[PDB]
Amino acid sequence: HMASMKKKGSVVIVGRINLSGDTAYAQQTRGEEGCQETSQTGRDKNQVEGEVQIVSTATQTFLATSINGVLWTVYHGAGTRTIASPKGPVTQMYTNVDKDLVGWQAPQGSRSLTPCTCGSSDLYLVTRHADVIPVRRRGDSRGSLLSPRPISYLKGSSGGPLLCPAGHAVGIFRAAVSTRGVAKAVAFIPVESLETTM
């Protein structure tokens, strides 16, 4: 009934991948209970830092990456959901189901990656466990893992970045190609497709 119709909660930042030093490591900034409440209210007063955020809904967790002032992630994770912020839910600035892409204004305190113009094919995928995985670029939107591994290790890292040797953003991870559960390749939204969307 119209009186009982519910609304989906906001995407909530629950942590980040720390890339500031010599060692990449995941940090949690909010536990599951506070995540649930923040998803319902859409208010998040937690300080945001860094480039790669770990984000969660009521039912899914995944990554979001700031590039050029936009926090980017995948539609198959976020749908059309708002993101929680200090002053309430923030509506998406970009939505493209055809690219599996959404974006919101980058949160206050985040740092953005610079879009890559190197034209290099030696990439690095950053996962939600702060693994830095070498990937050889194989096309506009595909790359092969130098060391294949079970897809389990990539699950939950959609929205994470592929970076060039210089640390620029080359793309946003969206899907894994596997054979008998072993990830051999990845698909990503290229930064140029983001830059067009911008």
Ligand SMILES: COc1ccc2nc(C)c(O[C@@H]3C[C@H]4C(=O)N[C@]5(C(=O)NS(=O)(=O)C6(C)CC6)C[C@H]5/C=C\CCCCC[C@H](NC(=O)OC5CC(F)(F)C5)C(=O)N4C3)nc2c1
């Ligand atoms: C509904 O509207 C939309 C619109 C456009 C969409 N567009 C895509 C491509 C898509 O694909 C879904 C979700 C995504 C995924 O699982 N993303 C990862 C992930 O981690 N998600 S996640 O964070 O855990 C989660 C679900 C958010 C919480 C990163 C990968 C890690 C492990 C894979 C597990 C097995 C799955 C292997 C599979 N592979 C594949 O589809 O291969 C082919 C696509 C191709 F490349 F062309 C070949 C795969 O990867 N996906 C399946 N749904 C869309 C939905």
Ligand SMILES: [Zn+2]
């Ligand atoms: Zn570069």
